[PDB]
A paper describes a structure:
Foot-and-mouth disease virus (FMDV) serotype A is antigenically most variable within serotypes. Neutralizing antibodies (NAbs) provided vital protection against FMDV and concurrently driven viral evolution under immune pressure in bovine. Thus, we determined the structures of A/WH/CHA/09 in complex with W125 scFv (FMDV-AWH-W125) and W2 scFv (FMDV-AWH-W2), respectively. The cryo-EM reconstruction showed that three-molecule W125 scFv and W2 scFv were both bound to the FMDV-AWH capsid around icosahedral threefold axis, but with W125 positioned closer to the center of threefold axis compared to W2 scattering around it.
The final resolution of the cryo-EM reconstruction was estimated by the gold standard Fourier shell correlation (FSC) = 0.143 criterion to be 3.75 Å for the FMDV-AWH-W2 complex and 3.72 Å for the FMDV-AWH-W125 complex. Distinct with W125, W2 makes contact with the VP3 involving B-B knob, BC loop, βC, CD/EF/GH loops, revealing a conserved antigenic site on VP3. Concretely, the residue (VP3D59) in the VP3 B-B knob interacts with residue (VLY36) in LCDR1. Meanwhile, residues in VP3 BC-loop (VP3R67, VP3D69 and VP3Q71), βC (VP3K76), CD-loop (VP3K84), EF-loop (VP3T131 and VP3T132) and GH-loop (VP3T178 and VP3T179) interact with residues in HCDR3 (VHD103, VHS112, VHS104, VHN101, VHN114 and VHY104) and HCDR1 (VHS30 and VHR31). Mutations at positions 59, 71, 76, 84 and 132 on VP3 obviously reduced antibody neutralization; in particular, VP3 residue 71 and 76 mutations resulted in a significant reduction (~10-fold) in the virus-neutralizing (VN) titer. Meanwhile, the sequence alignment of A/WH/CHA/09, A/GDMM/2013 and A/AF72 shows that the common residues (VP3D59, VP3Q71, VP3K76, VP3K84 and VP3T132) that contact W2 are strictly conserved. Further analysis of available FMDV serotype A sequences revealed the VP3K76 and VP3K84 were extremely constant with conservation of 99% and 100%, indicating that the two highly conserved interaction residues represent key determinants for conserved antigenic structure on VP3 of FMDV serotype A. Structure comparisons of FMDV-integrin and FMDV-mAbs show obvious clashes between mAbs (W2 and W125) and the integrin receptor, suggesting that FMDV neutralization by W2 and W125 is facilitated by blocking virus-receptor interaction via steric hindrance.
Author numbering:
A (entry chain L): 6 to 113
B (entry chain 3): 1 to 220
C (entry chain 4): 15 to 39, 65 to 84
D (entry chain 2): 13 to 217
E (entry chain H): 1 to 125
F (entry chain 1): 1 to 136, 155 to 209
Write the structure that this text describes.
C-alpha cells in the first residue's frame, strides 16, 4: 500500500498515521489490520478488524477507516510507542494479503 | 375457645417469585374493554418461532457475502444460543433470560441475488466431538448437513437437530469451558456461478420442538 | 411419601411444591432381594 | 453346566461357567430420550466380543489388590472406529472375565462392574460386593459373566470425556499354589458391547 | 503463556530448498491457525503461507508451489519448507498463530477482519 | 443352605431353617425416601454459596446415605440464616444473575427463612461420583442444584424431598482399632 514513511508526535500529543490503498485492496465493507513492530523484534497486532484492539493492547490506540483510507491514531504517546507500524489488508483482485510499505513513529 | 394457629417460624417471608397473591387494597374497578385486540401473543416462545430474526455477521451485516477468495466456508458459529453470530438475534435475546434451552433451533437461509447469478449452499451441523468445525464442504459432508440449489424458492429452511448427553443445555456458555458447550454449525457455499458480491441472508427461529425453562435473570 | 405427615392437601399445587415429573413411553434391589434363594439345597432330616 | 454366549458373529462358550449375573437391570432403559430428537441409530456391527489382558493373578498379590479396566477401553475394532466417529453413544458392557487354573490351587477372586469408579481407601474393598459381581475361583468356576445395562446421568455421554463402567477385579483370597496346581493364573476379559446406539455423526479429519 | 519459536538455517546456499520449523508452546497447535509471514530487509511484510487447524496448508498465490508447509499436532511443530531459495528473497521469517481456525487459508490470516494474529514469536532470518 | 456362592446369587437364610420362627419386620425407618427427609447442615457457607450436594460431611447420616448411592434425584428444601436479602437462581443461570433480583429471592425475616426449590439439574440424575471430568476425575460443575447469594450466611441447611437412590456403593462405617467393639458412650440417665 501507500502510507507516509515516518510521522513525528511529541509525548502526550495524539499522532495519526494514514494508510491508503485501492478500492479492490480495501473495500468500504472490508476492514484493515494495524501491526506495530519494535525494531529487532517480531511484529505486534494493535488493531484487528480496523475498529478494535487485540487483548493485551492499551485503549489509547484508535483506528478509523474512511473509503480507501485507513487511519491509526495513538493518544497519550509514550516512549514504548516509538516503533515501525504496518497496515495489513486483503486485496480481492490480488487474492493475497497486501502489507503497507511501513510507517515509523518518532517521539520528540 | 379460639383455634390455636401454631404459626411456623422461619418460613412465610415475602418472595419475589412467590405464587401467593397480595390482599386487594382497592375496590373492584372495570377497565376499558378490549376484545380480540390485534397482535396479542400468549407465549414468548411462539413469537420467536412465528417470526424469524437475522444473525450478527462481519461489520454488523446478517447476509453472508460470497468470499472474494476461494473459500468454501462462508461462516462457522457455535450452536450455543449465547454466540456472537446470534448475539443480535431476537431468539437468543428471549433465550438469554431462560437458564437452559432444549429442542431443535430452525435456521432459515434465503438467497438475495440477481436471477442471472445461481449458487449452491450447504448448511452442516457438526457435533461437539472434535477440537475444531468441519474444515471443508467435503470433510463436513459426514455430519448432518443439507445442500440446496438457489431456484424459484429463495428461502430454504434447515432445522438444527438438538443432540446432547444432557437432556437440557445451558443457554449461555460458562467461561470455564474453553470449547463450545454444544456443537458448532457451519454454512458452506460448495458451488457459486457468477456469485461475486452476492449476499445470502441467514436467519434463526425457534423450532417446533424447541422449548425454554427455569427462567432466571441474567444482566443484558 | 417421605417424612411428610401433615394430613391435609398441601396448600400449594403440586406443580409449585415439587418439580412435576415426566416419563418415557421397578425398584431393582427390592426385586433382587425378593428373588432370594431361601431354604435348603438337598434332602432334610 | 456349559454356558454359551454369542454376541454378533463371535461366540464364547465356557464349560465351567457358574452362570450370568445382571447388574441393576435385566434389560436396558428406553433408548430414545428427549435429547438427540430421535437421530440416534442402532449399530449391530459394534456388538462383538473384544479380548483384553488384565493383571496376571499370582500368589504374591495380597487381598485388596484391585485392578480396574475402564470401559470403553482403546478398541482397534469396528466399535473403536464407531466411538471415534460418533459424538454420543450408549452400550451395555456384558463383561466376561476368565482366569484359567489347574483347580488344585484354591484362591477367591471377585470381579465386579462399578459405575463412576473412584479409588477405594481399602475400607470400601470389604463392602465392594454391593456392585454387580461374580467370584472367580479355580475350585468351582474359572469364568465369570456379568451383563450390566449402560447407566449415566446423560442419556448419551461422549466416551472420550467420561467412561461410565470400569471392570474391577479384586483378589478376595490370595491364590495358594500347589505342586500339582498352576504356579500362576493369568486373567483375560472378553467384553462385547450390548444394545450399542450412536447419534450426532462427527465429521472426519 | 503463548510462545512461538522458529528453528532453521540463517544462511543457505542459493538454488536449494529452505526448510523451517515452528516450535509451538502454550496453546494446542490443533485449535489455532498458524501463518508464516516473511519480511524483506527494511521492507514491508509479505504473507507467505499458513496452515489451519485441520491442515488446510494454504499458500500465498504469488509464491505458490515454491514452498510446502506441513504441521504435526502431536509434536506441536509447524514446518514450512521453501524450494529454490534465492538471494533476492532474503528477509526475517515470522511464524504466528491466528485466533480463528482456517479463517482464510488462501491468504495467510486477516482476510475476515474479526480474528487477528495473537503471537508473532521471536522470529528467525 | 449350602448355596454354590461363586455366581454371587442373592441367597438369604432364615430362622425357620433350624426349627426357629421368622419374626415380622418393619423397615419404614430404614426406607431410603424417609431417611433423606431429615435436614442436614452444610459446611462451610460463604457469600454467593452454590447450594449443591456433596458439601454435607460424609460422616453425617444424610451425607453418608447420599454418598452410599452413586445416582440421587431429589427436591431440596434449603433453609438459610442470611443476614441480608438472599437470591436463589437455577444452575444454568450465571453468577451475575444473582444480583438482578428478578429471580426468586427471600427478604430478611426474624427467624431463618426456609424456601423449597425444585431440582433444575439438566442431567437426568445427578451423580455422587463421576469418572472423568467434562471440559471442552472431579464431578462436573453442572451437577450443582442452584446458587444462593446473600450479604452473609450464618448457616445453611439442606433437606432432600422425594429422594430416589440407585446403584448402591459401600457405607464405610467408622473403623474400630484394637477393640472387640466400638465401645462409644451411649446416652445414659443420671444415677
Amino acid at each position: 500500500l501507500t502510507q507516509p514513511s515516518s510521522v513525528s508526535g511529541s509525548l502526550g500529543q495524539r499522532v495519526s498515521i494514514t494508510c491508503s490503498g485501492s478500492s479492490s485492496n480495501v473495500g468500504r465493507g472490508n476492514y484493515v489490520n494495524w501491526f506495530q513492530q519494535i525494531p529487532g523484534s517480531a511484529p505486534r497486532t494493535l488493531i484487528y478488524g480496523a475498529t478494535s484492539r487485540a487483548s493485551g493492547v492499551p485503549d489509547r490506540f484508535s483506528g478509523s477507516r474512511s473509503g480507501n483510507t485507513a487511519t491509526l491514531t495513538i493518544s497519550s504517546l509514550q516512549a514504548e510507542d516509538e516503533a515501525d507500524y504496518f497496515c495489513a489488508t486483503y486485496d480481492s483482485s490480488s487474492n493475497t494479503a497486501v502489507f503497507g510499505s511501513g510507517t515509523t513513529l518518532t517521539v520528540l | 375457645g379460639i383455634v390455636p394457629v401454631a404459626c411456623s417460624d422461619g418460613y412465610g417471608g415475602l418472595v419475589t417469585t412467590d405464587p401467593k397473591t397480595a390482599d386487594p387494597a382497592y375496590g373492584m374497578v372495570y377497565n376499558p374493554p378490549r376484545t380480540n385486540y390485534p397482535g396479542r401473543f400468549t407465549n414468548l416462545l411462539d413469537v420467536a418461532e412465528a417470526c424469524p430474526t437475522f444473525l450478527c455477521f462481519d461489520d454488523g451485516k446478517p447476509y453472508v457475502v460470497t468470499r472474494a477468495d476461494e473459500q468454501r466456508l462462508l461462516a462457522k458459529f457455535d450452536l450455543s444460543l449465547a454466540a456472537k453470530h446470534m448475539s443480535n438475534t431476537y431468539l437468543s435475546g428471549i433465550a438469554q433470560y431462560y437458564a437452559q434451552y432444549s429442542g431443535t433451533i430452525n435456521l432459515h437461509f434465503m438467497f438475495t441475488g440477481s436471477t442471472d447469478s445461481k449458487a449452491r449452499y450447504m448448511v452442516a451441523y457438526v457435533p461437539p466431538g472434535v477440537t475444531t468445525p468441519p474444515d471443508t464442504p467435503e470433510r463436513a459432508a459426514h455430519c448432518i448437513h443439507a445442500e440446496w440449489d438457489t431456484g424459484l424458492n429463495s428461502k430454504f429452511t434447515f432445522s438444527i437437530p438438538y443432540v446432547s448427553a444432557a437432556d437440557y443445555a445451558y443457554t449461555a456458555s460458562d467461561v470455564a469451558d474453553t470449547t463450545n458447550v454444544q456443537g458448532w454449525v457451519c454454512i458452506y457455499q460448495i458451488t457459486h456461478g457468477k456469485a461475486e458480491q452476492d449476499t445470502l441472508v441467514v436467519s434463526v427461529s425457534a423450532g417446533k420442538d424447541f422449548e425454554l425453562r427455569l427462567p432466571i435473570d441474567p444482566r443484558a | 411419601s417421605g417424612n411428610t405427615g401433615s394430613i391435609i392437601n398441601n396448600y400449594y399445587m403440586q406443580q409449585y411444591q415439587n418439580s412435576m415429573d415426566t416419563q418415557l413411553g421397578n425398584d431393582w434391589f427390592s426385586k433382587l432381594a425378593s428373588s432370594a434363594f431361601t431354604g435348603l439345597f438337598g434332602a432334610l432330616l | 453346566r456349559i454356558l454359551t454366549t454369542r454376541n454378533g458373529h463371535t461366540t464364547s462358550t465356557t464349560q465351567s461357567s457358574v452362570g450370568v449375573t445382571y447388574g441393576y437391570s435385566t434389560g436396558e432403559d428406553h433408548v430414545s430420550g428427549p435429547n438427540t430428537s430421535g437421530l440416534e441409530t442402532r449399530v449391530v456391527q459394534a456388538e462383538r466380543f473384544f479380548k483384553k489382558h488384565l493383571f496376571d493373578w499370582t500368589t504374591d498379590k495380597p487381598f485388596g489388590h484391585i485392578e480396574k479396566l475402564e470401559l470403553p477401553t482403546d478398541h482397534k475394532g469396528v466399535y473403536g472406529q464407531l466411538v471415534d466417529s460418533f459424538a454420543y453413544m450408549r452400550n451395555g458392557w456384558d463383561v466376561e472375565v476368565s482366569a484359567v487354573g489347574n483347580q488344585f490351587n484354591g484362591g477367591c477372586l471377585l470381579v465386579a462392574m462399578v459405575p463412576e469408579f473412584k479409588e477405594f481407601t481399602t475400607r470400601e474393598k470389604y463392602q465392594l460386593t454391593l456392585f454387580p459381581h461374580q467370584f472367580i475361583s479355580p475350585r468351582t468356576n474359572m469364568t465369570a459373566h456379568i451383563t450390566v445395562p449402560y447407566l449415566g446421568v446423560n442419556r448419551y455421554d461422549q466416551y472420550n470425556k467420561h467412561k461410565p463402567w470400569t471392570l474391577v477385579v479384586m483378589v478376595v483370597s490370595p491364590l495358594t499354589t500347589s505342586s500339582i496346581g498352576a504356579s500362576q493364573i493369568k486373567v483375560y476379559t472378553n467384553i462385547a458391547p450390548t444394545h450399542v446406539h450412536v447419534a450426532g455423526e462427527l465429521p472426519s479429519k | 503463556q503463548v510462545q512461538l519459536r522458529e528453528s532453521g538455517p540463517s544462511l543457505v546456499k542459493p538454488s536449494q530448498t529452505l526448510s523451517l520449523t515452528c516450535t509451538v508452546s502454550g496453546f494446542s497447535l490443533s485449535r489455532y491457525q498458524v501463518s508464516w509471514v516473511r519480511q524483506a530487509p527494511g521492507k514491508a511484510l509479505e504473507c507467505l503461507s499458513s496452515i489451519s487447524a485441520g491442515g488446510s496448508t494454504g499458500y500465498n498465490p504469488a509464491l505458490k508451489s515454491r514452498l510446502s508447509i506441513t504441521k504435526d499436532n502431536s509434536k506441536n511443530e509447524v514446518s514450512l519448507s521453501v524450494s529454490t531459495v534465492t538471494p533476492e528473497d532474503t528477509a526475517t521469517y515470522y511464524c504466528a498463530k491466528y485466533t480463528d481456525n482456517y479463517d482464510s487459508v488462501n491468504a495467510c490470516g486477516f482476510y475476515s477482519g474479526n480474528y487477528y494474529f495473537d503471537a508473532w514469536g521471536q522470529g528467525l532470518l | 443352605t449350602t448355596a454354590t456362592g461363586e455366581s454371587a446369587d442373592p441367597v438369604t437364610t432364615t430362622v425357620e431353617n433350624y426349627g426357629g420362627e421368622t419374626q415380622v419386620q418393619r423397615r419404614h425407618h430404614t426406607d431410603v425416601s424417609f431417611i433423606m427427609d431429615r435436614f442436614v447442615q452444610i459446611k462451610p457457607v460463604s457469600p454467593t454459596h452454590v447450594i449443591d450436594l456433596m458439601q454435607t460431611h460424609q460422616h453425617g447420616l444424610v451425607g453418608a446415605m447420599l454418598r452410599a448411592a452413586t445416582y440421587y434425584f431429589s427436591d431440596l428444601e434449603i433453609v438459610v440464616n442470611h443476614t441480608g436479602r438472599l437470591t436463589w437462581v437455577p444452575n444454568g443461570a450465571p453468577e451475575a444473575a444473582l444480583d438482578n433480583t428478578s429471580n426468586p429471592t427471600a427478604y430478611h425475616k426474624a427467624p431463618f427463612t426456609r424456601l423449597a426449590l425444585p431440582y433444575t439439574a439438566p442431567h437426568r440424575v445427578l451423580a455422587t461420583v463421576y469418572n472423568g471430568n467434562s471440559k471442552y476425575a472431579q464431578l462436573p460443575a453442572s451437577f450443582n442444584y442452584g446458587a444462593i447469594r446473600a450479604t452473609e450466611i450464618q448457616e445453611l441447611l439442606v433437606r432432600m424431598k422425594r429422594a430416589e437412590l440407585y446403584c448402591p456403593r459401600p457405607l464405610l462405617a467408622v473403623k474400630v482399632t484394637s477393640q472387640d467393639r466400638h465401645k462409644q458412650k451411649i446416652i445414659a440417665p443420671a444415677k
